[PDB]
Ligand binder design. Sequence first.
Ligand SMILES: C=C[C@]1(C)C[C@@H](OC(=O)CSCCN(CC)CC)[C@]2(C)[C@H](C)CC[C@]3(CCC(=O)[C@H]32)[C@@H](C)[C@@H]1O
Ligand SMILES: [K+]
Ligand SMILES: [K+]
Ligand SMILES: [K+]
Ligand SMILES: [K+]
Ligand SMILES: [K+]
Ligand SMILES: [K+]
Ligand SMILES: [K+]
Ligand SMILES: [K+]
Ligand SMILES: [K+]
Ligand SMILES: [K+]
Ligand SMILES: [K+]
Ligand SMILES: [K+]
Ligand SMILES: [K+]
Ligand SMILES: [K+]
Ligand SMILES: [K+]
Ligand SMILES: [K+]
Ligand SMILES: [K+]
Ligand SMILES: [K+]
Ligand SMILES: [K+]
Ligand SMILES: [K+]
Ligand SMILES: [K+]
Ligand SMILES: [K+]
Ligand SMILES: [Mg+2]
Ligand SMILES: [Mg+2]
Ligand SMILES: [Mg+2]
Ligand SMILES: [Mg+2]
Ligand SMILES: [Mg+2]
Ligand SMILES: [Mg+2]
Ligand SMILES: [Mg+2]
Ligand SMILES: [Mg+2]
Ligand SMILES: [Mg+2]
Ligand SMILES: [Mg+2]
Ligand SMILES: [Mg+2]
Ligand SMILES: [Mg+2]
Ligand SMILES: [Mg+2]
Ligand SMILES: [Mg+2]
Ligand SMILES: [Mg+2]
Ligand SMILES: [Mg+2]
Ligand SMILES: [Mg+2]
Ligand SMILES: [Mg+2]
Ligand SMILES: [Mg+2]
Ligand SMILES: [Mg+2]
Ligand SMILES: [Mg+2]
Ligand SMILES: [Mg+2]
Ligand SMILES: [Mg+2]
Ligand SMILES: [Mg+2]
Ligand SMILES: [Mg+2]
Ligand SMILES: [Mg+2]
Ligand SMILES: [Mg+2]
Ligand SMILES: [Mg+2]
Ligand SMILES: [Mg+2]
Ligand SMILES: [Mg+2]
Ligand SMILES: [Mg+2]
Ligand SMILES: [Mg+2]
Ligand SMILES: [Mg+2]
Ligand SMILES: [Mg+2]
Ligand SMILES: [Mg+2]
Ligand SMILES: [Mg+2]
Ligand SMILES: [Mg+2]
Ligand SMILES: [Mg+2]
Ligand SMILES: [Mg+2]
Ligand SMILES: [Mg+2]
Ligand SMILES: [Mg+2]
Ligand SMILES: [Mg+2]
Ligand SMILES: [Mg+2]
Ligand SMILES: [Mg+2]
Ligand SMILES: [Mg+2]
Ligand SMILES: [Mg+2]
Ligand SMILES: [Mg+2]
Ligand SMILES: [Mg+2]
Ligand SMILES: [Mg+2]
Ligand SMILES: [Mg+2]
Ligand SMILES: [Mg+2]
Ligand SMILES: [Mg+2]
Ligand SMILES: [Mg+2]
Ligand SMILES: [Mg+2]
Ligand SMILES: [Mg+2]
Ligand SMILES: [Mg+2]
Ligand SMILES: [Mg+2]
Ligand SMILES: [Mg+2]
Ligand SMILES: [Mg+2]
Ligand SMILES: [Mg+2]
Ligand SMILES: [Mg+2]
Ligand SMILES: [Mg+2]
Ligand SMILES: [Mg+2]
Ligand SMILES: [Mg+2]
Ligand SMILES: [Mg+2]
Ligand SMILES: [Mg+2]
Ligand SMILES: [Mg+2]
Ligand SMILES: [Mg+2]
Ligand SMILES: [Mg+2]
Lengths: 56, 118, 123, 207, 114
Amino acid sequence: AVQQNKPTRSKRGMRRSHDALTAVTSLSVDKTSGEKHLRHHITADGYYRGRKVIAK
Amino acid sequence: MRHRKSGRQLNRNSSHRQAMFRNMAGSLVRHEIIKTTLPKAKELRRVVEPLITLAKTDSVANRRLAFARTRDNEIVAKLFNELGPRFASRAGGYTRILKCGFRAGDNAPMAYIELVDR
Amino acid sequence: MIQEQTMLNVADNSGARRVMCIKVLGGSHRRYAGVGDIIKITIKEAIPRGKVKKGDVLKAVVVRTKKGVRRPDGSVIRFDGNACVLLNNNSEQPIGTRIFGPVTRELRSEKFMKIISLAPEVL
Amino acid sequence: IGLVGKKVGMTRIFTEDGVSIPVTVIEVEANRVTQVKDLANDGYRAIQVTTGAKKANRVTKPEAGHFAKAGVEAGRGLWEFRLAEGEEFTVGQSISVELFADVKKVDVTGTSKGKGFAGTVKRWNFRTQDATHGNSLSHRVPGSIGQNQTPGKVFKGKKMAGQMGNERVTVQSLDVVRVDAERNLLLVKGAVPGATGSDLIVKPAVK
Amino acid sequence: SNIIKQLEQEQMKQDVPSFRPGDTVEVKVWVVEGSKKRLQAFEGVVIAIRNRGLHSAFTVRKISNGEGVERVFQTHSPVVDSISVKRRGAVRKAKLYYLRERTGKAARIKERLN
RNA sequence: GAUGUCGGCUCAUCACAUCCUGGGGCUGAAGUAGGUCCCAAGGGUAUGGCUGUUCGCCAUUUAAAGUGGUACGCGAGCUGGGUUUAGAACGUCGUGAGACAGUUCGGUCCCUAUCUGCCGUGGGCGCUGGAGAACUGAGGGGGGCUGCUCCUAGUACGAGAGGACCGGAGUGGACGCAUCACUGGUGUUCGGGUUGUCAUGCCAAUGGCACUGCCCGGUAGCUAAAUGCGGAAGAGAUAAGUGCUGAAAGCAUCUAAGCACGAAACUUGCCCCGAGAUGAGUUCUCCCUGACCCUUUAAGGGUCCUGAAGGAACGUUGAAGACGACGACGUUGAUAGGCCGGGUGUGUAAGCGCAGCGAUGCGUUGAGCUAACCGGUACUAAUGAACCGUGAGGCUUAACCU
RNA sequence: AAUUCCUUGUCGGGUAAGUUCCGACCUGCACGAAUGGCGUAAUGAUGGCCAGGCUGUCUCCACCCGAGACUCAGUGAAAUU
RNA sequence: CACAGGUGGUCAGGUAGAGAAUACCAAGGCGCUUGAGAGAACUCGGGUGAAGGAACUAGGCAAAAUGGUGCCGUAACUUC
RNA sequence: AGCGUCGAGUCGGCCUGCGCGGAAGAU
RNA sequence: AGGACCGAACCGACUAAUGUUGAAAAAUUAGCGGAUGACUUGUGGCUGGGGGUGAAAGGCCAAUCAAACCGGGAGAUAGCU
Ligand SMILES: C=C[C@]1(C)C[C@@H](OC(=O)CSCCN(CC)CC)[C@]2(C)[C@H](C)CC[C@]3(CCC(=O)[C@H]32)[C@@H](C)[C@@H]1O
Ligand SMILES: [K+]
Ligand SMILES: [K+]
Ligand SMILES: [K+]
Ligand SMILES: [K+]
Ligand SMILES: [K+]
Ligand SMILES: [K+]
Ligand SMILES: [K+]
Ligand SMILES: [K+]
Ligand SMILES: [K+]
Ligand SMILES: [K+]
Ligand SMILES: [K+]
Ligand SMILES: [K+]
Ligand SMILES: [K+]
Ligand SMILES: [K+]
Ligand SMILES: [K+]
Ligand SMILES: [K+]
Ligand SMILES: [K+]
Ligand SMILES: [K+]
Ligand SMILES: [K+]
Ligand SMILES: [K+]
Ligand SMILES: [K+]
Ligand SMILES: [K+]
Ligand SMILES: [Mg+2]
Ligand SMILES: [Mg+2]
Ligand SMILES: [Mg+2]
Ligand SMILES: [Mg+2]
Ligand SMILES: [Mg+2]
Ligand SMILES: [Mg+2]
Ligand SMILES: [Mg+2]
Ligand SMILES: [Mg+2]
Ligand SMILES: [Mg+2]
Ligand SMILES: [Mg+2]
Ligand SMILES: [Mg+2]
Ligand SMILES: [Mg+2]
Ligand SMILES: [Mg+2]
Ligand SMILES: [Mg+2]
Ligand SMILES: [Mg+2]
Ligand SMILES: [Mg+2]
Ligand SMILES: [Mg+2]
Ligand SMILES: [Mg+2]
Ligand SMILES: [Mg+2]
Ligand SMILES: [Mg+2]
Ligand SMILES: [Mg+2]
Ligand SMILES: [Mg+2]
Ligand SMILES: [Mg+2]
Ligand SMILES: [Mg+2]
Ligand SMILES: [Mg+2]
Ligand SMILES: [Mg+2]
Ligand SMILES: [Mg+2]
Ligand SMILES: [Mg+2]
Ligand SMILES: [Mg+2]
Ligand SMILES: [Mg+2]
Ligand SMILES: [Mg+2]
Ligand SMILES: [Mg+2]
Ligand SMILES: [Mg+2]
Ligand SMILES: [Mg+2]
Ligand SMILES: [Mg+2]
Ligand SMILES: [Mg+2]
Ligand SMILES: [Mg+2]
Ligand SMILES: [Mg+2]
Ligand SMILES: [Mg+2]
Ligand SMILES: [Mg+2]
Ligand SMILES: [Mg+2]
Ligand SMILES: [Mg+2]
Ligand SMILES: [Mg+2]
Ligand SMILES: [Mg+2]
Ligand SMILES: [Mg+2]
Ligand SMILES: [Mg+2]
Ligand SMILES: [Mg+2]
Ligand SMILES: [Mg+2]
Ligand SMILES: [Mg+2]
Ligand SMILES: [Mg+2]
Ligand SMILES: [Mg+2]
Ligand SMILES: [Mg+2]
Ligand SMILES: [Mg+2]
Ligand SMILES: [Mg+2]
Ligand SMILES: [Mg+2]
Ligand SMILES: [Mg+2]
Ligand SMILES: [Mg+2]
Ligand SMILES: [Mg+2]
Ligand SMILES: [Mg+2]
Ligand SMILES: [Mg+2]
Ligand SMILES: [Mg+2]
Ligand SMILES: [Mg+2]
Ligand SMILES: [Mg+2]
Ligand SMILES: [Mg+2]
Ligand SMILES: [Mg+2]
Ligand SMILES: [Mg+2]
Ligand SMILES: [Mg+2]
Ligand SMILES: [Mg+2]
Ligand SMILES: [Mg+2]
């Protein structure tokens, strides 16, 4: 099965109207380190909820 | 439908899953913290925590059951001599999962799983 | 749970030994006969001198089934084989004069009271 | 009117004459009248009821003000029952399962269990095609879905695969086996829609 | 849960005897033939037990008038008047479905002597 | 510059010239059972043997086994037996190549769906301040089948033979919805037996591999063969039909005026969807009661302060689920895992001791182990925040109140 | 009849029921003797028919294990128009 | 094509086994150049199935079944 | 006409205008 | 002894499913036939296009066969599109 007519740039754009990405709503701030991080995830420097959980 | 069913298939067959969790349980007991995918970490709790519970009561029978389930006498010794004693007064919850972002190669959600008194 | 093509043993002294169900009677698209239901049969095996012959087409009442019968408390009675009693095609009265093996209380009705009376036990 | 309850599960009642009655156990706690609707204000006659309990932190301010007007504790939801002409109720009144003490049969409404996306075999009792005899990839598939150029379309309501279950279902004319006001229980003969723990609406049988 | 367990507990028989698969049991059941109610005995080998509280059941197999018969009794049913163990059997398995393929000498169960 | 073909399968949909069930007139209609015509399309409307068959014949059912239309409905849905390629043979025709609306054996069925359509399921915006709920019901859909037995009654009817209407009670078939208490299936996540082999130093005990190695059982869940429930009654308006009163037409006449009956069709009643019903409805509750500047004076634009109700997001998740969605829960906490106790299943672990030359048996012991179950329990993970959403909501007119 | 149009010939067998099959009959549309006739043990991934066993082929499907399908990240076609 | 294809010779360990079959291993060599989740329909490849047992179908197609060694025993017909 | 009653029209053909039945189909 | 029997290698290709913009311009998987012979296989050689070769299918002769491929006559001819 294949198209009988070439779909338009308009229709292509309409299909892609749901493709937009969503930015992370907000980042959390660790209470000790002050580092931004994804909520419920450890920081880049290995903190979570103010505790040095992971060294380096 | 999967109503009320437990256990993740993890895109493996039963023999592969069993072997993988035996290996990963060994790794967590040895190192006390490992990094793995978040779903594997959640499944690993159901394998590792019963081994620690078993290890609270040191007997020949329990060491052999632990050996049947781990196949590593270094792991069995650590379970019975170190971890069982360390967790003697703790009613479950011997591990904690800490989410740690996404793997570079495949964007897999990752977590650390560690023993709680590490 | 007897259907077309099911082979049954015979629980009587009609002379038939093996019969095949060729119709479950008593409704359009009716799938199954259980204990106490009337079926159409053909005789597949009969003893040399009986009241019936191989190839005769007649009726039978199912008296024992492997699927069995449920009772009002949830209990089940199951038999090791399927068996029926041959009936005259017109009168629907037993051909034989003796009944072999147990039957069930499901046959206690006016039509089959003769089978109950002849049966060695009723479960 | 009826009452809102919860499906506890199924069991049986043995009678002395050796009948086992399969029963659904429905927990029917006090239904509290939260609003009375009348012709003047609402254009129809009904009671709104709540039952059970909700944690204060999950009760929104709009919900809480509605319950506070009635002078009732917050329950887990709100449901309406239409009133017949002689039926009168007051806001704050509690209605118990004793309502059904002399009711012989009930209709029970619940949300059926959810089967997710179901094929035509399961959803509509379509017959399978041959497992063998040359069948190519078409064992549980639906078969033809229409005719030809006339009408050159599929008709609305065509039975096809899709969401099955997880919908409102009423089972009518179930025997009331026992009304136990002390334990807040209604026992009805036979199965009713939904999973253990789901909400049930129980009404005297319409037929 | 607690509700159902309470509803079930009040219906449970309190004097059900101990028995095991392989035991010979005689079950006396009520038979109502008009106004006449009487006890009928069904004696045979217990081949299966379902332990399930009020929903407990057990399956008894006998060879009756030349025919194998199995009855699944609902243990707490009032139809079952009484259960008595006539012989204790020594078997390994919980479920003795293998006896369905056995007759006569092949179907014998050793007595459990303790 | 291709509109795939007989028959089957799957899935249908319409017509009515009706096969059954419903209503009715006439009968050469006693009854039972028929004949024939009228009304009626709600629902229902065989399985097999033979043959590629459609059909037909036959067997045995059924209330009945309707007739037609839909590309002789349906191959981007299946089949490929028939038919119509290439091989081969028979009969036949032909000197022959070959041929036959003769036969015979063998003989590749492609397509990831763009649009329409259809089944499901979301996102957007709208509905005029915002928000959380409960609804009304325009409208739409589903459902609508029927046997047998008994009673009425061996009554009415009939010479007898036989044998009712009307009305009542029960019990089924088929179909549908739900459910898992029971009976069962499954149950590669539970327990056990066992073959070969390799390993853990060895013994003993275990693990890997051999389709889950092969098996025997089996929890939860899912489930049918399991077991609950359904079709209706009632009402309205009618069809054919039957009438009342009644002239035109002193009579007669169901009809012209007027009035009454009358069917599974129709409108309701039952079940489900349903306010995008843009004609965007209703009810209840909740929230926001700050300054100032500017110009293209306007439903104008901006700045500072403010950020509610609620929402979303994230997390732990669910008998919810393709994803979205929907539901529960987030420490003031049982949301999930673990843990504790129980249940269930398997069927008497290991170790030790005893008996035996030994395989093995016996004791400790209904032991040990035990998933998705039940009852509990903050041990682990569900974070303080942050984010979105604002700051009293247009004009006109009427009525009521200042 | 690998040949018979009429034809599902007729009769018998087998089946509850057999346009096929087997046995006969002869009315050979249009067999027939090395473009061989009629048989024939053995042989055959050969054609037809029947029976026992066996079964999800089917009544009528259910559940389960895996690979896809679905979601996320990376890469990234096609016929057609 | 870093392609389930094709390509002659030589070597020949252990346990079980008639065996170079087959299972498990040794020496030795590999996990096959996308992964991660989820646990719908449907498709593919498999396992089990109550009662029935060819009713399926053009046709038992496919599946299920049988399956080893020793001994006993074995019909018509036959070119023996 | 209906019942000698009875007291005004009545009867049935022809021609012609317009209607009625005859009249069942498939999204 | 054997164009003997059962059965791997080896040589084949009867059935089914898959695949059919394939993993593959003929395969894969489960079954299947031959397997001391009219067997199979390596290397090299010979036969050439109206010609070869053919246990014969118009089969095969470099993914091409009722007359190969390449170049030429050549812009054959085309009352057809
Ligand atoms: C090739 C054409 C086919 C596929 C089949 C065709 O059938 C025939 O043409 C039968 S005669 C040819 C048979 N065969 C070659 C010997 C080729 C199919 C058949 C059935 C008709 C008779 C002619 C029209 C048709 C389209 C519709 C149809 O029914 C087809 C054509 C346009 C179709 O493309
Ligand atoms: K039709
Ligand atoms: K009539
Ligand atoms: K109709
Ligand atoms: K056509
Ligand atoms: K076709
Ligand atoms: K098409
Ligand atoms: K297709
Ligand atoms: K279009
Ligand atoms: K169940
Ligand atoms: K189960
Ligand atoms: K082993
Ligand atoms: K609205
Ligand atoms: K949804
Ligand atoms: K918990
Ligand atoms: K023991
Ligand atoms: K022991
Ligand atoms: K136990
Ligand atoms: K001929
Ligand atoms: K010749
Ligand atoms: K000869
Ligand atoms: K043959
Ligand atoms: K040439
Ligand atoms: Mg076009
Ligand atoms: Mg998109
Ligand atoms: Mg769970
Ligand atoms: Mg994957
Ligand atoms: Mg394995
Ligand atoms: Mg669900
Ligand atoms: Mg079918
Ligand atoms: Mg194919
Ligand atoms: Mg297939
Ligand atoms: Mg159109
Ligand atoms: Mg064209
Ligand atoms: Mg009509
Ligand atoms: Mg209609
Ligand atoms: Mg109607
Ligand atoms: Mg037919
Ligand atoms: Mg057609
Ligand atoms: Mg048609
Ligand atoms: Mg196709
Ligand atoms: Mg088509
Ligand atoms: Mg063909
Ligand atoms: Mg030819
Ligand atoms: Mg409708
Ligand atoms: Mg049913
Ligand atoms: Mg249960
Ligand atoms: Mg079971
Ligand atoms: Mg196991
Ligand atoms: Mg050992
Ligand atoms: Mg190994
Ligand atoms: Mg190996
Ligand atoms: Mg008059
Ligand atoms: Mg009806
Ligand atoms: Mg137990
Ligand atoms: Mg053990
Ligand atoms: Mg003991
Ligand atoms: Mg426990
Ligand atoms: Mg012929
Ligand atoms: Mg003939
Ligand atoms: Mg046959
Ligand atoms: Mg004949
Ligand atoms: Mg013949
Ligand atoms: Mg000849
Ligand atoms: Mg001659
Ligand atoms: Mg000659
Ligand atoms: Mg010859
Ligand atoms: Mg992608
Ligand atoms: Mg590669
Ligand atoms: Mg390669
Ligand atoms: Mg080779
Ligand atoms: Mg090998
Ligand atoms: Mg799957
Ligand atoms: Mg199988
Ligand atoms: Mg199993
Ligand atoms: Mg079965
Ligand atoms: Mg069975
Ligand atoms: Mg059989
Ligand atoms: Mg058949
Ligand atoms: Mg058929
Ligand atoms: Mg086969
Ligand atoms: Mg097989
Ligand atoms: Mg040979
Ligand atoms: Mg070849
Ligand atoms: Mg092969
Ligand atoms: Mg051979
Ligand atoms: Mg061989
Ligand atoms: Mg040729
Ligand atoms: Mg070639
Ligand atoms: Mg030429
Ligand atoms: Mg020239
Ligand atoms: Mg030219």
